[PDB]
């Protein structure tokens, strides 16, 4: 359970399920969640926009791009080994951690649920390719295989 | 069961190293289907 | 198995003397540890001398232009009489000061309901939370109301963490065999 | 009383209903390590300072 | 049949370390009159296997060298040394376990450029946030150290009641780690109002919710996504 | 700092991140997983000579 | 447990919370507004990396049944998983599933090598335990190596 | 059943003793003789927490 | 033979300031200020202990 109230939420949780929902529990869970919410969703946008009316703010905004672009460059999950069972890996700093799909448990979402069938139904990005060199038109370039 | 235990730890052994020891005595631990052993060390040593 | 009774190491060569105490240490390390119950070593694995020192004790650079609390800790003038105790032990910018001159600087001061364990160290071998090591409760003469959605109470957070939020996840693993 | 004592204005810090911790009198003892035991009182745990 | 009259051995060692090896364990069967008669071929199974070790096998952690220190920042008076993750650690393998920066302080060559640029109008305050005038003594502290209510008269624009905030607001206003997916520091402050008083009330018995400034719409409807 | 300093800057997002929401939805999330098994076996032999 | 304890449990912990994930800072990045913070921020450094040399459990020699080694000071204490017990975890049963084999176990360190190049470097042996019988292998590498002080 | 309920911790340094071990203390001959200490440590014990 | 693992969150996370805006307590800092300024490990490791 994410998000609501400790006390309706443990209750939920502590059901089994045998039954499946305990209706009255799950309303009031969803009464705590009205109480507290949790980030389900969202559009991002880059954070860099927001540095504005501060002493240099044009200055340390481009410092910061240029910044950003080196630290996704070296900071990018695409670097990881992938997961399993089709869990999308994140990369804080020094460790990869996979996000396992609905119907994927344990740790690193190594082992499946029952139903989850769909065996090697598999497909995320490599890295990016360093640049090419500047071409005729003095364009660089570069590429990420799906690999 | 009676439990073994210590009588007290001798002086001080005279310096050429240092050393006391433990006879295990004061309540001898085998009488009466005796318990458990005293506790370790039986004996003790040291530098002066 | 057998017990195996530990065994000191000789001592280390003395550290260089300490010019705030004019003593030198050495540490005896652990030759063999104690296992399986075998008797631990017995005796201290450090023992001090005295020395002449040939380095000088450094002495504090004072607070210059900021307020001194009085354990010798610095802080910004602007926090005297702020009403919130911004000398962590010591009050000491709330000394002699006038209820008159006291702001309202705040609402409320109660922070979140266990954040001074936030401001423990921690032993990574041992797995312990350790002592005190971080003030948790530096309010800098900020306001920093936050509405805990959980426990449904206004909480003030210090005016210098990143970010401290009541989102609840539960998690239940349930077995027969 | 005697630092209070002849003060011409006391300026009350601890305003607030503030209890003592609980027991925390009880560790100021010093205990007989071989023993196990509390004894007299050692350290003055009511000084707020 | 009583099929546990012909025992269960002990499981195989797992078949490997790591990345899903299995093991096994057949029954010390004897065939025999007993084995026979009570039907012990028909439906005792004569072995099981079962998955080990499943857990991928562990990545450790890679660190490069530095590189060269920095050209020492005039005002921090630290120059930079970083070095680079080779490889990150997963699957339980053993972290970097050290700095991936390190700082030492410099003697600078230059002088610092940066100066104090003093916003023009707006109430400066002793954070050294500039606010609209109209915020100061307008009754509500914004600079959050009550700068703008420090000396103040009439509190021109307090609204009507003490509506409640929004409920998690402040998770709005926390930064996003995109490539971490994992909330961050507050970024931002979801408790300015600006002295607008504009509410939404969620539900008829709620009372309304203040809306902050920085938010420009809010809709409360259920959905069961 | 003024000057681009790659760590300084790196700091940021170590502390705040890359992004921040323009848009969002919030919400609960329920995930429940139940699984049971059962194996019977009875046996009852009769021999006579 | 009852479904009343367990709710109220749940809810009284949101008023005295323990700490339960956290991520880790080494100590010494905290040495700071001192005399001379610069180089006891150092000697801290160096003194952590003494500490976990002393209580690092290498030193214990393996503990059976998969029971884990810990320094107690001088004195290593094998804690036995479930139900298994005496001086090295022999006596009794575990419990549940296990993978079977002995699992190895790093040797200590060796002290590093003297700056050769300027670079420290170290290695470490596996050897405590051997794996042995199916057991899993020691985790991690088997040697490092450091820019000198 | 064992309950855990707080931690405490003594400051490291520069403690405010109890008045009643100061007195006692105080009045501690220079010179060695051990009768004054084990009274000492009747009183107050051996070692505090 | 159960087994229950059981975790409630309450606070979602903290995040702690950087080094540079971290106010160290006064009793801690006062032991840094005792430090040797000097490789004695014997107080750097009663302040681990600690």
């Given at each position: 359970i994410r998000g609501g109230r400790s006390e309706y939420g443990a209750a939920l949780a502590w059901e089994?399920?045998?039954?499946?929902?305990?209706?009255?529990?799950?309303?009031?869970?969803?009464?705590?969640?009205?109480?507290?919410?949790a980030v389900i969703d969202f559009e991002l946008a880059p954070i860099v926009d927001l540095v504005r009316n501060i002493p240099c703010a044009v200055?340390?905004?481009?410092?910061?791009?240029?910044?950003?672009?080196?630290?996704?460059?070296?900071?990018?999950?695409?670097?990881?080994?992938?997961?399993?069972?089709?869990?999308?890996?994140?990369?804080?700093?020094?460790?990869?951690?996979?996000?396992?799909?609905?119907?994927t448990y344990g740790e690193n979402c190594e082992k499946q649920s029952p139903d989850y069938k769909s065996n090697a139904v598999d497909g995320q990005w490599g890295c990016w390719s360093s640049w090419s060199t500047c071409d005729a038109t003095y364009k660089r370039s570069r590429t990420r295989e799906c690999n | 069961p009676i439990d073994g235990k210590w009588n007290c730890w001798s002086n001080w052994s005279s310096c050429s190293g240092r050393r006391k020891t433990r006879q295990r005595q004061c309540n001898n631990p085998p009488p009466q289907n005796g318990g458990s052993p005293c506790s370790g060390p039986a004996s003790e040593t040291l530098d002066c | 198995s057998s017990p195996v009774n530990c065994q000191w190491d000789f001592y280390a060569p003395w550290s260089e003397c300490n010019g705030c105490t004019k003593t030198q240490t050495r540490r005896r390390s652990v030759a063999v540890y104690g296992q399986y119950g075998g008797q631990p070593c017995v005796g201290n694995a450090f023992e001090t001398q005295s020395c002449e020192p040939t380095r000088g004790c450094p002495t504090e650079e004072g607070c210059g232009e900021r307020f001194r609390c009085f354990s010798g800790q610095c802080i910004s003038k602007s926090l005297v009489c702020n009403g919130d105790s911004d000398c962590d032990e010591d009050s000491a910018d709330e000394d002699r000061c006038e209820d008159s001159e006291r702001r309202p600087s705040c609402d409320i001061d109660k922070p979140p309901p266990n954040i001074e364990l936030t401001g423990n160290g921690y032993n990574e071998l041992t797995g312990q939370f350790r002592n005190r090591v971080i003030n948790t409760k530096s309010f800098g003469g900020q306001c920093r109301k936050v509405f805990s959605g959980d426990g449904k109470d206004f909480y003030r957070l210090s005016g210098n963490v990143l970010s401290y939020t009541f989102q609840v996840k539960i998690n239940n693993d349930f077995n027969y065999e | 009383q005697s630092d209070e004592a002849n003060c011409r204005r006391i300026y009350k810090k601890c305003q607030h209903e503030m209890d003592q911790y609980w027991g925390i009198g009880s560790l100021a003892s010093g205990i007989n390590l071989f023993t196990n035991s509390f004894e007299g009182p050692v350290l003055d745990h009511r000084y707020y300072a | 049949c009583f099929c546990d009259h012909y025992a269960w051995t002990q499981w195989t060692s797992c078949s490997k370390t790591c990345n899903s090896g299995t093991q096994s364990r057949h029954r010390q069967i004897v065939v025999d009159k007993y084995y026979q008669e009570n039907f012990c071929e028909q439906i005792c199974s004569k072995q099981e296997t079962r998955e080990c070790n499943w857990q991928r096998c562990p990545i450790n952690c890679l660190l490069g060298d530095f590189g060269p220190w920095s050209d020492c920042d005039p005002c921090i008076e630290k120059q930079s040394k970083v070095r680079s993750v080779l490889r990150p650690s997963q699957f339980g393998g053993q972290p970097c376990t050290a700095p991936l920066v390190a700082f030492q302080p410099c003697i600078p060559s230059k002088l610092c450029k940066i100066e104090e640029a003093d916003c023009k109008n707006k109430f400066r305050c002793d954070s050294g946030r500039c606010i609209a005038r109209k915020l100061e003594c307008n009754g509500e502290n914004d600079c959050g150290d009550n700068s703008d209510e420090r000396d103040c008269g009439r509190t021109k624009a307090v609204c009507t009641r003490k509506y409640n905030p929004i409920p998690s607001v402040q998770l709005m206003g926390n930064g996003f780690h995109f490539l971490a997916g994992e909330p961050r520091g507050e970024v931002l402050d979801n408790s300015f109002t600006g002295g607008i008083c504009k509410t939404v009330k969620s539900s008829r018995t709620s009372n309304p919710y203040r809306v902050p400034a920085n938010l420009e719409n809010v809709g409360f409807e259920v959905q069961t996504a | 700092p003024l000057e681009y300093n790659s760590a300084l800057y790196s700091r940021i997002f170590d502390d705040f991140g890359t992004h921040y929401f323009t848009s969002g939805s919030l919400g609960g999330v329920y995930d429940l997983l139940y699984q049971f098994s059962s194996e019977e076996l009875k046996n009852s032999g009769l021999t006579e000579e | 447990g009852n479904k009343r304890r367990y709710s109220a449990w749940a809810e009284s912990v949101?008023?005295?919370?323990?700490?339960?994930?956290?991520k880790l800072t080494p100590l010494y990045e905290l040495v700071k507004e001192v005399p001379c913070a610069s180089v006891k921020k150092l000697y801290l450094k160096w003194a952590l990396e003494e500490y976990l040399d002393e209580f690092d459990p290498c030193h214990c020699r393996p503990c059976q049944n998969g029971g884990l080694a810990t320094v107690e000071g001088t004195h290593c204490l094998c804690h036995c998983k479930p139900y298994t017990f005496g001086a090295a975890c022999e006596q009794g049963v575990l419990v549940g599933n296990q993978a079977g084999g002995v699992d190895g176990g790093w040797s200590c360190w060796s002290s590093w090598s003297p700056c050769v190049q300027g670079k420290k470097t170290r290695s470490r042996e596996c050897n405590n335990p051997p794996p042995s019988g199916g057991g899993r292998s020691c985790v991690g590498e088997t040697t490092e190596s450091t820019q000198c002080e | 059943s064992d309950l855990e309920v707080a931690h405490y911790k003594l400051k490291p340094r520069s403690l405010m003793l109890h008045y009643e071990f100061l007195q006692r203390?105080?009045?501690?001959?220079?010179?060695?003789?051990?009768?004054?200490?084990?009274?000492?440590?009747?009183?107050?014990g051996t070692h505090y927490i | 033979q159960l087994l229950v693992v059981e975790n409630t969150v309450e606070v979602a996370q903290f995040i702690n300031n950087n080094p540079e805006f971290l106010q160290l307590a006064e009793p801690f800092w006062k032991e840094l200020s005792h430090l040797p300024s000097l490789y004695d490990y014997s107080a750097y490791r009663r302040l681990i202990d600690q």
């Open positions: 089994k399920g045998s039954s499946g929902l305990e209706e009255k529990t799950f309303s009031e869970w969803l009464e705590s969640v009205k109480e507290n919410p200055t340390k905004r481009n410092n910061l791009r240029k910044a950003l672009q080196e630290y996704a460059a070296k900071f990018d999950p695409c670097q990881c080994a992938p997961c399993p069972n089709n869990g999308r890996p994140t990369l804080s700093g020094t460790e990869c951690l996979c996000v396992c799909q609905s119907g | - | - | - | - | - | 949101t008023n005295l919370p323990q700490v339960i994930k956290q | 203390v105080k009045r501690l001959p220079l010179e060695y003789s051990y009768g004054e200490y084990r009274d000492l440590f009747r009183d107050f | -």
